[PDB]
Amino acid sequence: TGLLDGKRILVSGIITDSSIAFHIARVAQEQGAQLVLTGFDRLRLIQRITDRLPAKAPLLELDVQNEEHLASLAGRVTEAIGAGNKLDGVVHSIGFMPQTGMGINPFFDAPYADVSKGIHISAYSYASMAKALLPIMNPGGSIVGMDFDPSRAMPAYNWMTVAKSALESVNRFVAREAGKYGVRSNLVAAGPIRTGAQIQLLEEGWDQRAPIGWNMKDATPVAKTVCALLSDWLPATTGDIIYADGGAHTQLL
Amino acid sequence: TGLLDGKRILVSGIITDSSIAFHIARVAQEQGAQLVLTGFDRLRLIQRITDRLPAKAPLLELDVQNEEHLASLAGRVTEAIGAGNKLDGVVHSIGFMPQTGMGINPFFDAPYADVSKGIHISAYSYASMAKALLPIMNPGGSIVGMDFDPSRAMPAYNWMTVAKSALESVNRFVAREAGKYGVRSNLVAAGPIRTEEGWDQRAPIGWNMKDATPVAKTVCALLSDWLPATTGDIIYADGGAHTQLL
Amino acid sequence: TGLLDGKRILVSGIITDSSIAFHIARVAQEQGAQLVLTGFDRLRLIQRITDRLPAKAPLLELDVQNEEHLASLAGRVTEAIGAGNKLDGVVHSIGFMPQTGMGINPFFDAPYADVSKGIHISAYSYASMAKALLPIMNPGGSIVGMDFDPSRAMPAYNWMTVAKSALESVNRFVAREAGKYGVRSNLVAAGPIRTEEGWDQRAPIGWNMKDATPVAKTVCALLSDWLPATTGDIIYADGGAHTQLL
Amino acid sequence: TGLLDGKRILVSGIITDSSIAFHIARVAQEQGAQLVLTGFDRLRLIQRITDRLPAKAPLLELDVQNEEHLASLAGRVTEAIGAGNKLDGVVHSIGFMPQTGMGINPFFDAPYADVSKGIHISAYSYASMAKALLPIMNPGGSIVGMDFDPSRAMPAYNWMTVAKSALESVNRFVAREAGKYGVRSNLVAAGPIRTGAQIQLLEEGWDQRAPIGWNMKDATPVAKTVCALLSDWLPATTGDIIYADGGAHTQLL
Ligand SMILES: NC(=O)c1ccc[n+]([C@@H]2O[C@H](COP(=O)([O-])OP(=O)(O)OC[C@H]3O[C@@H](n4cnc5c(N)ncnc54)[C@H](O)[C@@H]3O)[C@@H](O)[C@H]2O)c1
Ligand SMILES: NC(=O)c1ccc[n+]([C@@H]2O[C@H](COP(=O)([O-])OP(=O)(O)OC[C@H]3O[C@@H](n4cnc5c(N)ncnc54)[C@H](O)[C@@H]3O)[C@@H](O)[C@H]2O)c1
Ligand SMILES: NC(=O)c1ccc[n+]([C@@H]2O[C@H](COP(=O)([O-])OP(=O)(O)OC[C@H]3O[C@@H](n4cnc5c(N)ncnc54)[C@H](O)[C@@H]3O)[C@@H](O)[C@H]2O)c1
Ligand SMILES: NC(=O)c1ccc[n+]([C@@H]2O[C@H](COP(=O)([O-])OP(=O)(O)OC[C@H]3O[C@@H](n4cnc5c(N)ncnc54)[C@H](O)[C@@H]3O)[C@@H](O)[C@H]2O)c1
Ligand SMILES: Oc1cc(Cl)ccc1Oc1ccc(Cl)cc1Cl
Ligand SMILES: Oc1cc(Cl)ccc1Oc1ccc(Cl)cc1Cl
Ligand SMILES: Oc1cc(Cl)ccc1Oc1ccc(Cl)cc1Cl
Ligand SMILES: Oc1cc(Cl)ccc1Oc1ccc(Cl)cc1Cl
């Protein structure tokens, strides 16, 4: 028997097989979880991608900017898992920031519409997804979104850092809401995962700072962590952040 | 001599004489600073308010959602303080969240359009004001914005809390940029001011919500040369409350 | 199959069946783990308590102030689980502060001798237990100690709070060392357990002080292979309370 | 007129002219502060050291392990500043950890008696000094101790890191006590100050991470910060930590 046996879990954020949500999905199904999956735009592609998953799973469309997608999302899931059934888990692995706000572009050159669009997608959508889905979730359930420690500024990450700080603050509020349904809300703050010279420097220090090391080619440790929060072995943790970063954020040098 | 003697400081955010920015300006002027002041919509009203300060100061219009007010800010400021002169301090004391994402409204019912507008005015504008004014600031200078500790979730504050968390993240990126200019960037996270009961109890030294002067003082401390090694950071002017659980 | 199936786990700190360590052990045994258990002074009494667990387990004496109990611990553990075998988990659920530095006594009136003894038993022993048992642990293993969030000051807890702050600092240094062994080291910061009212109110999911099982579960989660990328860290088993201000 | 005019301030922790407390003393006197100074053992040396200070100041003996020194400390200060006078400021710049617990020695090889002695001197003494001195302090007053950010483990620092975490937790409690007298208690978390290859790496990254840079040969920025807290321009901050580290702790890379 597996970690997530009989639990019905919605996973968003699969675009390729390198996506963190592919591995979360992969590992959740390995542990006996019944998935519903959502995707944004390139649906034809992600049909073939999610076929490379261990088990079959209905695939729905969900642009988190789209207001019709959100209002219909409860009924579409319910149809997909069968009326009378409910979700025990929800995975948010969605994030986007335009290259105007992340990377080489100077922090001060990002226009607000672009920053606004990235904050919409990477932080606010955690609330509106929880809002869509909370009415069709069982007590004991668990919502989990993906994070990248924003405690300190770093190069490149720029406005995506700022989006992740907003996400964290959003997580604490969603938990207030989720808790009235007896449902937990947490973030997994992951280390860098391989989905210019400066960026190599960060990733390098990550493995060096990590007391147990950090392999950027391996997404499984993060998938596992998420399934831990989706399981029942972490039942008194909510509003919170769990770090799957090799322990790097706990070490200065 | 005064704490800010001979320093030129931009003070944004006066709308009333209850405004934190008003007391900051008042104290900065009490301590010898030369101010330039900015105002949003009600210019005539705050002209009447800004006439209540100890000393006179130029009043520029600044709506931080307005791209033309931003790209022209440097030039307008220069004209006020005189060419060749640069600012030594900038006060961001601007916030706004529509009532749809702050108050009695449930946290899930705030439209993005409204939360995006609040985050624009409360967070992103700390960066775009720095962007504008950094070219016209002196080495050793200081940019300070107003904060309310968002490390934990709380009733009512809702998406403004989310705004403040973003500001804190922005402040750390603004100090990256500011440092290229020899300039500092810090936040004062202040207790609740009457522009709560738990706040005063928790505060080891106590907390008066009817007094903004202790907060104004902490801002001025940051605008001076007595905290020259702190940037990207947050000074808590809160009676100590956030250091205490109960 | 069980969560800890086939894993050998040291559980320290049982003195009663109200002890957090008792429920941890009970749950680890419910989930298929093989235990070795340690006890301080009252060995016969906890023999009687440890007979109340689902499955039987060897009971070693361990006073962490005793240097001879430490240097002999590895050898004694090996003898219990059989040579060639190594532990996969270690539970530090030991704390003590004399009443002179925890309770009604004022914070300034605790002698150092008493605070030093409490910090010895509550903090430094997390390191010396790791020091002892690291040589006899398998790669992929996990060391977990018990914590109570000390990030803010609070009445009564006093110098035990200071102990817990030191533990947290020690845990981060223990994970440095543990990592050389492919082993993890983390703290569970738990809510108040009946071995407060504010705690349940703040907890978004609620907090039952009469139930230690949700905390025991979180410990077991850390002893398993489902959090393999977390070390030097703190998991809060507190109903979410510490994420909420009011 | 200066920052600290008419304020009577006790400064501990001068052993040489490179000490952070020499500069705190130096800068406090420059700003019109009336000092009382304490020292540990080598009193003859620190008499000549403190002569190189701008202004004269009574010099008392204070071993913070010594229980007689502490119980007599209020009366000795009072004699030194004149009966009826009181202290407006107190500076704790004391720290020690034996080399068994700090540097090359493996973390696990430090014996508790040594760690216990370093924790006594670097953390517990902040309480017992506040205890000695609080009865002879004016409302509006300020106690300030020296800190080195312990949020994360780093090499070398080892058990001194642990001592500083204890200090921080102690600061939050002293503020509870100090507040009944209307006196603030804060820490200045300073960057590294020049008072093997690995240690050079830390100091280097400090200046690199510091958005405004960090000069390890210059103690004045830290002295200034302390005088800020000793002044009246930070009157609603207590139980707290101020970082004079160039902004380095706010930056990952
Ligand atoms: N990649 C890393 O190093 C790592 C580390 C920490 C955190 N994270 C976070 O994990 C999450 C997924 O990361 P990833 O590396 O797997 O990225 P990915 O590019 O593989 O996946 C991101 C997903 O966001 C989806 N998306 C974008 N806009 C959307 C919209 N408008 N509506 C619905 N979906 C939308 C995309 O379709 C995509 O599947 C992100 O939130 C990311 O910030 C990743
Ligand atoms: N009052 C409190 O308890 C408290 C506590 C902590 C932090 N703060 C912060 O202090 C700052 C000022 O708050 P205050 O209490 O003086 O409130 P206030 O209402 O008096 O000031 C807010 C100011 O922001 C200005 N503003 C709004 N939209 C603007 C725009 N688009 N462009 C330019 N200016 C705009 C307003 O005109 C006003 O002067 C804010 O950042 C607020 O978040 C307040
Ligand atoms: N009860 C709570 O609300 C709570 C909350 C958070 C954290 N904790 C932590 O959980 C851990 C265990 O607490 P508990 O509530 O089960 O209390 P408990 O009194 O049942 O357990 C404390 C244990 O420490 C042992 N101990 C004391 N001195 C020792 C020594 N010198 N050598 C070896 N063992 C020694 C005792 O024998 C006892 O079994 C402690 O670390 C405590 O700080 C407790
Ligand atoms: N040096 C740095 O890079 C730096 C950075 C951060 C924090 N700090 C802290 O600042 C403080 C002073 O540091 P420094 O670099 O000036 O060191 P320093 O060696 O020059 O001064 C340390 C002082 O502690 C005193 N002392 C030791 N044991 C004592 C005792 N038993 N009783 C009374 N006094 C005793 C010594 O006499 C000495 O004057 C320390 O707490 C240190 O940890 C220093
Ligand atoms: O958060 C992240 C952190 C890292 Cl180190 C790498 C990738 C991350 O995730 C993203 C960043 C930007 C955009 Cl547009 C989309 C995604 Cl999915
Ligand atoms: O941050 C704040 C904290 C508190 Cl206790 C009270 C008011 C605050 O600030 C605001 C809240 C909403 C809007 Cl529309 C404008 C401002 Cl200035
Ligand atoms: O950490 C704790 C937190 C709480 Cl709410 C209650 C008890 C705790 O733990 C202790 C306190 C004092 C002693 Cl002598 C022994 C232990 Cl185990
Ligand atoms: O805290 C410190 C931090 C740094 Cl980077 C350098 C020195 C420090 O201070 C000390 C460390 C050990 C001992 Cl025995 C005495 C003192 Cl004064």
Whether B37 and B43 have beta carbons less than 8 Å apart is answered as no
Relative orientation angle of helices C20-30 and C213-223, to the nearest 10 degrees:
60
Q: Name the burial class of residue A2, with classes exposed (0-12), middle (13-18) and buried (19+) by CB atoms within 10 angstroms of its CB.
A: middle
Helix or strand holding residue A80 (H, E):
helix A67-81
Is residue C190 a contact partner of residue C147, using CB atoms and an 8 Å limit?
Answer: yes
Q: Is D215 in the pocket of ligand 4 (CB under 6 A)?
A: no
In this structure, what are the phi and psi dihedrals at residue D129, rounded to the nearest 5 degrees? -70, -50
The answer to whether A245 and A214 are in contact (CB under 8 A) is: yes
Nearest CA to CA, how far is C244 from chain B (Å)? 5
Query: D2 pairs with which residues across the strands?
Result: none
User: Are residues C243 and C191 in contact, defined by beta-carbon separation less than 8 angstroms?
Assistant: no
Residue C40 has phi, psi (to 5 degrees) of -85, -75
- Residue in C closest to D126 by C-alpha: C108
Chain A residues close to B170, C-beta within 8 Å: 162
Taking the C-alpha atoms of residue A237 and residue C205, their distance in angstroms, rounded to an integer, is 9
Residue B242 is classified by DSSP as: G
Q: Which of B203, B170, B235 is nearest to D189 (CA)?
A: B235
d(CA D71, CA D81): 17
Of B26, B25, B34, the closest CA to residue B5 belongs to B34
Any ligand 8 atom below 6 A from CB of D14: no
Is residue C1 classed exposed, middle or buried when 0-12, 13-18 and 19+ CB atoms within 10 A define those classes? Answer: exposed
Instruction: Give the 3-state secondary structure of residue D129.
Output: helix
A54/A27 Cα distance (integer angstroms): 9
- How far apart, in Å, are the Cα atoms of C6 and each of B78, C22, C85, C139, C194? 74, 19, 11, 14, 31
Domain C1-246 architecture = 3-Layer(aba) Sandwich (3.40)
Q: How far is the CA of D36 from the centre of ligand 5 (A)?
A: 56
**Helix (H/G/I), strand (E/B), else coil: C187:** strand
CA dist., res. A163 & res. A150, Å (int) = 9
Long-range contacts of C64-67 (CB under 8 A, 24+ apart): C64/C94, C64/C120, C64/C121, C64/C125, C64/C128, C64/C129, C65/C117, C65/C120, C65/C121, C65/C125
Q: Which ligand is located closest to the Cα atom of residue D112?
A: 3
Total residue length of chain A: 253
Sequence-ordered list of residues with C-beta below 8 angstroms from that of C142, at least 6 positions apart, any chain:
C88, C89, C90, C183, C184, C185, C186, C222, C223, C224, C227
Contact D154, D28 (CB under 8 A): no
The CATH fold assigned to D1-253 is Rossmann fold (3.40.50)
| Pocket flag, ligand 2, residue B21 (CB < 6 Å) | yes
Contact D247 B224 (CB under 8 A): no
D243 annotated as belonging to a binding site for a ligand: no
Which ligand has the shortest distance to the CA of A216? Answer: 1
Tell me how long chain D is: 253
Find out whether C62 and C14 touch, Cβ atoms under 8 Å.
no
Position of tokens 């030294």?
B205
Ligand 5 binding pocket includes A159 (Cβ within 6 Å): no
Quickly tell me which residue has 């830290």 as its tokens.
Answer: D222
The candidate with the shortest Cα–Cα distance to B185, out of A162, A158, D250, A106, is D250
| φ and ψ at residue C138, rounded to 5 degrees | -85, 150
Residue pair D249/D243 in contact by the 8 Å Cβ criterion? yes
Q: Is C76 exposed, middle or buried (0-12, 13-18, 19+ CB in 10 A)?
A: middle
* Contact status of C197 with chain B (Cβ, < 8 Å): no
For residue A175, give the 3-state DSSP assignment: helix
Alpha carbons C125 and C120: distance in angstroms, whole number: 6
**Does B93 count as an annotated binding residue?**
no
Strand-pairing partners, residue D92, are D145
Nearest to C152 among B153, B198, B243 (CB): B243
- Asked if residue B20 belongs to a known ligand binding site, the reply is yes
CB contact under 8 A, C155 and B246: yes
**C147: β partners:** C189
CB contact under 8 A, B227 and D228: yes
Give Cβ neighbours of residue A164 (< 8 Å, ≥ 6 apart): A122, A123, A147, A148, A149, A150, B169
What are the extents of the domains in chain B?
1-246
Cβ-based neighbours of A187, under 8 Å, separated by 6 or more: A144, A145, A146, A147, A167, A168, A171, A240, A241, A242
Residue D187 CA: which ligand is closest? 4
B116 neighbourhood in chain A, CB within 8 Å = 116, 119-120
State the binding site of C for substrate.
157
Residue among B64, B151, B160 to mutate when testing ligand 6 (max atoms within 8 A of CB): B160
Ligand 1 near A60 CB (within 6 A): no
Alpha carbon distance B177, A158 (integer Å): 11
Q: Please name which of A142, A134, A156 lies closest in space to residue A188, comparing C-alpha atoms.
A: A142
Q: Is D252 within 8 Å of A202 when comparing Cβ atoms?
A: yes
Is C137:C86 a contact under the CB 8 Å cutoff?
yes
CA C242 to chain centre: 20
Q: Does ligand 4 come within 6 angstroms of the Cβ of D22?
A: no
Q: Is B85 in contact with B78 (CB distance < 8 Å)?
A: yes
Tell me how far apart the alpha carbons of residues A49 and A111 are, in angstroms, rounded to a whole number. Answer: 34
**Tokens 């705030």, located at residue:** B110
Check pocket membership of B13 for ligand 2, CB cut-off 6 A.
yes
Q: Which chain C residues contact residue A243 at CB under 8 A?
A: 229-230, 233
Tokens of A135: 């009415």
Q: Which residues of C touch B152 (CB under 8 A)?
A: 242-245
Which residues from chain D sit within 8 angstroms of residue B182, using beta carbons?
212
Number of residues that this document lists for chain C:
246
Using CA atoms, how far apart are residues A11 and A25, in angstroms rounded to an integer? 7
> Across the interface, which of A153, A202, A249 has its CB nearest the CB of D250?
A153
Q: How far is CA B242 from CA B237, C215, D249, in A?
A: 10, 26, 20
Q: Which residues line ligand 7 (CB under 6 A)?
A: C 95-97, 102, 148, 160, 192
Ligand 4 center from residue D252 Cα (angstroms): 27
Q: Where do we find the tokens 């009946």?
A: C194
Q: Resolution limit in angstroms?
A: 2.3
The SS3 call for residue C140 is strand
Instruction: Establish whether residue D145 lines the binding site of ligand 4, counting it when its CB lies within 6 angstroms of any ligand atom.
Output: no
Q: Is D168 on the interface with C (CB under 8 A)?
A: yes
Most informative mutation of C12, C16, C64, C148 for ligand 7 (most atoms within 8 A of CB): C148
Q: D212 and D191 in contact (C-beta within 8 Å)?
A: no
Number of helical (H) and strand (E) elements in chain A, helices listed first: 8, 7
B47 C-alpha to ligand 7 centroid (Å): 59
Question: Distance between CA atoms of A30 and A48, rounded to whole angstroms?
Answer: 19
- How far does the centroid of ligand 4 lie from the alpha carbon of residue D193, in Å? 11
- For the annotated binding site of A for NAD(+), the residues are 19-20, 63-64, 94-95, 164, 193
DSSP one-letter code for D191: P
Strand C87-92 relative to strand D59-61, pairing: unpaired
Contact indicator for B207, B239 with CB cutoff of 8 Å: yes
Exposed/middle/buried for D68, CB within 10 Å: 0-12, 13-18, 19+?
Answer: exposed
**8 A C-beta contact, residue D101 and residue D160:** yes
Strands A59-61 and B8-12: unpaired
Chain A residues with CB under 8 Å of B120 CB are: 112, 116
- Nearest Cβ partner for C232 among A179, A211, A222: A211
Tally helices (H) and strands (E) across chain C: 9, 7
- Residue with the nearest Cα to atom 9 of ligand 1? A146
B 86-115 → C contacts, CB under 8 A? none
Nearest residue (CA) to ligand 7, atom 4: C192
Q: Which residue, among D126, A175, D163, has the nearest Cα to C107 in the 3D structure?
A: D126
D157 carries a ligand binding annotation: yes
- Report how far ligand 7's centroid is from the alpha carbon of C192 (Å): 9
DSSP alpha helices (H): ranges in B2-142?
A: 20-30, 43-50, 67-71, 73-81, 112-119, 125-133
Question: How would you label A18-45 residue by residue, b for 16+ Cβ within 10 Å and e otherwise?
Answer: ebbbbbbbbbbbbbebbbbbbbbeeeee
Answer for the pair A195, B183: CB distance below 8 angstroms, yes or no.
no
